[PDB]
Amino acid sequence: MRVVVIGAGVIGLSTALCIHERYHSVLQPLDVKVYADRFTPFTTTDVAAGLWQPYTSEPSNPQEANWNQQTFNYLLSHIGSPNAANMGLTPVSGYNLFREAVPDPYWKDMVLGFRKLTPRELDMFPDYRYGWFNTSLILEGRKYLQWLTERLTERGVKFFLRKVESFEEVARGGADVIINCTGVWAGVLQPDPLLQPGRGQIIKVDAPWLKNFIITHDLERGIYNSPYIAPGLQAVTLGGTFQVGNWNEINNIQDHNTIWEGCCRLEPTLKDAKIVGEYTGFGPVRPQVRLEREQLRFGSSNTEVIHNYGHGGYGLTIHWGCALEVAKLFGKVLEERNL
């Protein structure tokens, strides 16, 4: 076959690798290209802290807790390999703070050492009156993308810089299968106004004395409109804003003062952390992940398409579940085609 993957973010490259691991032999050669107008370090994936943690409450699609679980277990299996940290993978422990007592999350027994905070702990945090502690994982976006681009190149997957204009023009290029992995920009190739953009600003600092994460939660304001501190491999991610339907790609100063004041509130040692950079990304926000097979018929050419977009603010936390599931749908295509 001639396979083409559109997108080189986490969801792109992970999905391209999951396929090629499962469906390629020396006697059964496969040809995967990867098309993309942004590669690392310039993707939305590169911008994300990389902490493994789904959302507080239940999920509307219960496939998506299962994809979350499969991703955690795939990741944890690499903890203790010599290469973990070369994938961008390190364990980390932290706090989730709240203004009110809330139910436990469904993932409580997926993570390591989940528990409620003590009174003493809650005085480290004067503005908060309930929380949790747990150990989890940092899968750093920029590093995992580097790791994947390498593992994928040893297996002869070729790379092309190119802004695709429509699925049409990829069918005419002579493509049997298209894997669509464009996160927030899939609503250009084929309309979908259920896909809004999630606009998050982060500040990256040198504050190497911070080893725990700290996530605040304001339930009114919704996910990631409330201070967070995530240690990384080489630097620390301050964040705090997540505006849905805002398309502005510039950094802007309100978001800065909001992330800086609220994060200093939390960890006042930050007055001496030097700022390394400021960044803005767009979440592929969608009420459910669009992961499904679709046949198309572009004038002359018939094509086979699988979408993998709309992972919102949880693409790293779920990617490998999604990536596996795609290769299923790809398998079923191969069953019809006698190969």
Ligand X SMILES: Cc1cc2nc3c(=O)[nH]c(=O)nc-3n(C[C@H](O)[C@H](O)[C@H](O)COP(=O)(O)OP(=O)(O)OC[C@H]3O[C@@H](n4cnc5c(N)ncnc54)[C@H](O)[C@@H]3O)c2cc1C
- Name which of ligand 7V3, a second copy, ligand X, none residue 3 binds, using a CB cut-off of 5 to 8 Å depending on partner kind: none
Is the Cβ of residue 14 or residue 280 nearer to ligand 7V3 in the bound state?
280
Strand pairing report for 130-139 and 228-231: unpaired
> Contact with a second copy (CB under 8 A): which of 268, 274, 297, 338?
268
Which candidate, 210, 201, 261, 264, places its Cα nearest to that of 233? 210
* Interaxial angle between packed helices 10-22 and 315-336, expressed in degrees from 0 to 180 and rounded to the nearest 10: 40
Quick check: 95 binds ligand X (CB under 6 A)?
Answer: no
**What residues numbered 224-283 form the site for ligand 7V3, per CB under 6 A?**
224, 228, 230, 239, 242, 283
> Contact with a second copy (CB under 8 A): which of 1, 65, 91, 190?
91
Which stretches of the chain are DSSP H helices?
Answer: 10-22, 44-47, 63-78, 121-124, 141-154, 167-172, 186-189, 253-266, 315-336
How far is it, in rounded angstroms, from Cα 53 to Cα 92? 12
To the nearest whole angstrom, how small is the minimum distance from the Cβ of residue 119 to ligand X?
26
* Choices 46-54, 136-144, 146-154, 323-331 (CB under 6 A): range interacting with ligand 7V3: 46-54
Is the Cβ of residue 98 or residue 144 nearer to ligand X in the bound state?
144
Quick check: 51 binds ligand 7V3 (CB under 6 A)?
Answer: yes
How far is it, in rounded angstroms, from Cα 173 to Cα 201? 37
Quick check: 122 binds a second copy (CB under 8 A)?
Answer: no
> Contact with a second copy (CB under 8 A): which of 231, 240, 262, 312?
231
- Check residue 245 and report its DSSP letter: T
In this structure, are residues 203 and 275 in contact, taking their beta carbons and an 8 Å threshold?
yes
CA angle (6 as vertex; 4, 12 as ends), nearest 5: 105
Q: How many residues bind a second copy (CB under 8 A)?
A: 35
Joined tokens for residue 309: 């977009």
How far is it, in rounded angstroms, from Cα 102 to Cα 100? 6
* Choices 8-16, 21-29, 94-102, 287-295 (CB under 6 A): range interacting with ligand X: 8-16
Question: Applying CB under 6 A, which residues contact ligand 7V3?
Answer: 49, 51, 53, 198, 200, 213, 215, 224, 228, 230, 239, 242, 283, 313-314
Question: Applying CB under 8 A, which residues contact a second copy?
Answer: 79-86, 90-93, 112-113, 115, 117-118, 120-121, 124, 133, 135, 138, 208-212, 231, 233-234, 268-269, 271-272
